[PDB]
Ligand binder design. Structure first.
Ligand SMILES: NC(=[NH2+])c1cc2cc(-c3cccc(OC4CCCC4)c3[O-])[nH]c2cc1Cl
Ligand SMILES: [Ca+2]
Length: 223
């Protein structure tokens, strides 16, 4: 997160860190045994780390659970990043409490201007790499589809939306990938892609979760 602030320990209880010997992507807990992340964060050997604040220090509240299976969307396209969503089933259910809790899936899509919270342990510099130890937060609005398409002509599908600031300075970045975009208490987006981080007129592009709720529900129900 570039231009964001320290969230505060466990203030984002649905935030998870996907770890393979180091933090590589974020994710969101949607129930005690399932997490939603981005398809481009897929790899084998994933350990899901819940209740984390400093990812390099065991401070208490952490639950480390191995992923039993990861389900990348069948129509995921790695060239366009269209359908960039993946479901990870945990080997055992997590113990939910005030520090580890799930986030609700949306019943409707959000509108432009809706302010959302994006969080993660991704890079905090736009020019260079600085990864943080604790969780960073950024409040950002969903942009209108004309502004989004004008920024990325020909690259936005109906399963994506842009959020952020066209003036640059505040944005999500690599490492925040797969993590949550929460608006009014509902998971509306997944950190997917953008041109650089916090560059002027190049907002972040997010997977539009409201278009996948029946898919998530049917897939969970059958696995
Ligand atoms: N807000 C933005 N401008 C932005 C920037 C990046 C940058 C990435 C990104 C860059 C390099 C590698 C990535 O994933 C690899 C690391 C782990 C597996 C795939 C990214 O997600 N994702 C991004 C997502 C966004 Cl929304
Ligand atoms: Ca920790």
């Amino acid at each position: 997160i570039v231009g964001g602030y320290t969230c505060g320990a466990n203030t984002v209880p649905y935030q998870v860190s996907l770890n393979s010997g180091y933090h590589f992507c974020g994710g969101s807990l949607i129930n005690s045994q399932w997490v939603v992340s981005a398809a481009h964060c897929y790899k084998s050997g994933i350990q899901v780390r819940l209740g984390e604040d400093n990812i390099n220090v065991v401070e208490g509240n952490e639950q480390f659970i191995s992923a039993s299976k990861s389900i990348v969307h069948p129509s995921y396209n790695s060239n366009t990043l269209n359908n960039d969503i993946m479901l990870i089933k945990l080997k055992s259910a997590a113990s939910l409490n005030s520090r580890v809790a799930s986030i609700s899936l949306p019943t409707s899509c959000a509108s432009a201007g809706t302010q959302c919270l994006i969080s993660g342990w991704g890079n905090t510099k736009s020019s260079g790499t600085s990864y943080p130890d604790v969780l960073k937060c950024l409040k950002a609005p969903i942009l209108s589809d004309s502004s989004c398409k004008s920024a990325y002509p020909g690259q936005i599908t109906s399963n994506m939306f842009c959020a952020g600031y066209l003036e640059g300075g505040k944005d999500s970045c690599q490492g925040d990938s797969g993590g949550p975009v929460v608006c009014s208490g509902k998971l509306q987006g997944i950190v997917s892609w953008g041109s650089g981080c916090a560059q002027k007129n190049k907002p972040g592009v997010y997977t539009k979760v409201c278009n996948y709720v029946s898919w998530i529900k049917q897939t969970i129900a059958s696995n």
